[PDB]
Amino acid sequence: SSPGIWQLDCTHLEGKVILVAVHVASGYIEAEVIPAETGQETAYFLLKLAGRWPVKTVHTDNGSNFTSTTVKAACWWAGIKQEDGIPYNPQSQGVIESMNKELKKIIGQVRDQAEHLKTAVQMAVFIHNHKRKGYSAGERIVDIIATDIQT
Amino acid sequence: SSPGIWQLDCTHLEGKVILVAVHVASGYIEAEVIPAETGQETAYFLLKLAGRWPVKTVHTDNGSNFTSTTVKAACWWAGIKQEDGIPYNPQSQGVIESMNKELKKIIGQVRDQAEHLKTAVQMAVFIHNHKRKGYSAGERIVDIIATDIQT
Ligand SMILES: O=c1n(-c2ccc(Br)cc2)cc2n1CCCC2
Ligand SMILES: [Cl-]
Ligand SMILES: [Cl-]
Ligand SMILES: [Cl-]
């Protein structure tokens, strides 16, 4: 199950919304800037994600996206099991919180290199996914999925 | 090195532009709809791509993008070797052409399920990357990159 599990996360900066998908087992992320977190924006984001990686399960970021007919339609279309994001394990909240703080720190470090926030966010995605902690998140996700394919 | 080689491709539909990146060894793709193919749009697309996969070399789709200072700046930022896309092997032009025709066929098959072209394009990316040819393009890219990380 673990190779296909992702978590949605919504954070705010500069009066805008940054929508993040985290591959839970690796820490690998994809992210986008949107005007506001609507069902239509979340649905489209999930469609993109699932065309790019083998997304089996998504823990949604809030109850509005869990309820959304548009989000449910995208999950149906893309073969995604839509689940809640209730942190039954309480360390999940702290991990997400730490991630948002770290992403915002990186955005700050690149902000002056980017005219638009969306460029800074994608620079932050790049830096995060390439950072060695020794393997990177990008290396870990590929290894996890490749091992799963060989089953 | 083949695991890191991508090719840019620009095709047109409904008076709009579809920008495609193909992982040459696997056939895996990412794509976006843009109003027009500018250096700024191409640069941003490459930044996104390189944050998500280990992009070493990009064969650019035309001379304007090869020349573009904005595209060159993004390639510099993201650690991408920007190359030309001259088909020294002539089978390349046919492979790209066949890809565009197939993508447009899939878009036609889903078009009525999508209000906006961009949704149809992402549905086509999904269908293409999951199609078993027996492995899918999505499976092939992960295997190729995972083997490269391990060797
Ligand atoms: O590195 C991260 N993150 C993460 C993602 C982005 C940033 Br920026 C910081 C941490 C989230 C997780 N992991 C590892 C596995 C648990 C989930
Ligand atoms: Cl919002
Ligand atoms: Cl949208
Ligand atoms: Cl154009």
Side-chain angles (χ1 to χ4, degrees), chain A, chain B residues 2-151:
Chain A
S1 196
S2 171
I5 298 173
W6 293 75
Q7 168 79 233
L8 282 178
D9 161 50
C10 183
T11 193
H12 297 75
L13 197 71
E14 295 180 19
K16 296 200 179 66
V17 171
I18 303 168
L19 188 52
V20 183
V22 186
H23 183 257
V24 180
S26 65
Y28 170 98
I29 70 171
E30 303 219 5
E32 74 172 13
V33 173
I34 52 179
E37 192 185 35
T38 62
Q40 272 175 283
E41 293 287 355
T42 303
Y44 183 67
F45 181 74
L46 292 170
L47 176 59
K48 286 186 294 176
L49 185 69
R52 288 156 178 74
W53 294 98
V55 179
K56 178 189 182 204
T57 304
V58 63
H59 291 275
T60 50
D61 59 323
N62 58 54
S64 294
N65 276 336
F66 187 63
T67 301
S68 168
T69 57
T70 309
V71 173
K72 283 185 199 299
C75 289
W76 167 79
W77 199 95
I80 301 169
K81 177 168 177 175
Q82 189 207 217
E83 288 179 13
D84 58 54
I86 297 165
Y88 296 109
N89 187 333
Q91 286 198 341
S92 299
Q93 296 171 102
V95 166
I96 294 167
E97 273 152 34
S98 287
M99 177 178 83
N100 287 341
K101 176 174 173 181
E102 187 62 34
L103 280 182
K104 287 177 186 177
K105 186 179 175 195
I106 302 162
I107 290 163
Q109 291 169 354
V110 303
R111 193 65 189 87
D112 74 317
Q113 297 175 55
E115 172 176 37
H116 302 114
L117 178 62
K118 68 180 193 178
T119 293
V121 168
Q122 303 307 325
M123 288 174 169
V125 167
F126 183 108
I127 289 165
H128 171 76
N129 286 339
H130 284 85
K131 182 98 99 73
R132 277 167 203 291
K133 257 142 60 69
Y135 300 89
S136 67
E139 288 172 335
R140 293 192 293 269
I141 186 169
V142 166
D143 173 46
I144 288 163
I145 296 169
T147 306
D148 184 56
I149 291 164
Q150 317 336 316
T151 65
Chain B
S2 171
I5 298 172
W6 293 74
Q7 180 146 343
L8 282 178
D9 161 50
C10 183
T11 193
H12 297 75
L13 197 71
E14 295 180 19
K16 296 200 179 67
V17 171
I18 303 168
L19 188 52
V20 183
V22 187
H23 183 257
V24 180
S26 65
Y28 170 98
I29 69 171
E30 303 220 5
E32 74 172 12
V33 173
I34 52 179
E37 192 185 35
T38 62
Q40 273 181 91
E41 293 287 355
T42 303
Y44 183 67
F45 181 74
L46 292 170
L47 176 59
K48 286 187 293 177
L49 185 69
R52 288 156 178 74
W53 295 98
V55 179
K56 178 189 182 204
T57 304
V58 165
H59 291 275
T60 50
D61 59 323
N62 59 54
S64 294
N65 276 336
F66 186 63
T67 301
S68 168
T69 58
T70 309
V71 173
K72 283 185 198 299
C75 289
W76 166 79
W77 199 96
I80 301 169
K81 288 183 186 188
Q82 189 207 32
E83 288 179 13
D84 59 54
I86 297 164
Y88 296 109
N89 187 332
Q91 286 198 134
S92 299
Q93 68 189 101
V95 166
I96 294 167
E97 150 219 79
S98 189
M99 177 179 82
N100 287 341
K101 174 173 148 148
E102 186 61 33
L103 280 182
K104 287 177 186 177
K105 186 178 179 75
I106 301 162
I107 290 162
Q109 291 169 354
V110 303
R111 193 65 189 87
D112 74 317
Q113 297 175 55
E115 173 155 39
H116 302 114
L117 178 62
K118 68 180 193 178
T119 293
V121 168
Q122 303 307 325
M123 288 174 169
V125 167
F126 184 109
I127 289 165
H128 171 78
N129 287 339
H130 288 260
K131 185 180 192 197
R132 277 166 204 290
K133 315 283 286 218
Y135 301 113
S136 67
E139 288 172 335
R140 293 191 293 269
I141 187 169
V142 166
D143 174 47
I144 288 163
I145 296 168
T147 305
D148 184 56
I149 293 164
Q150 282 18 282
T151 51

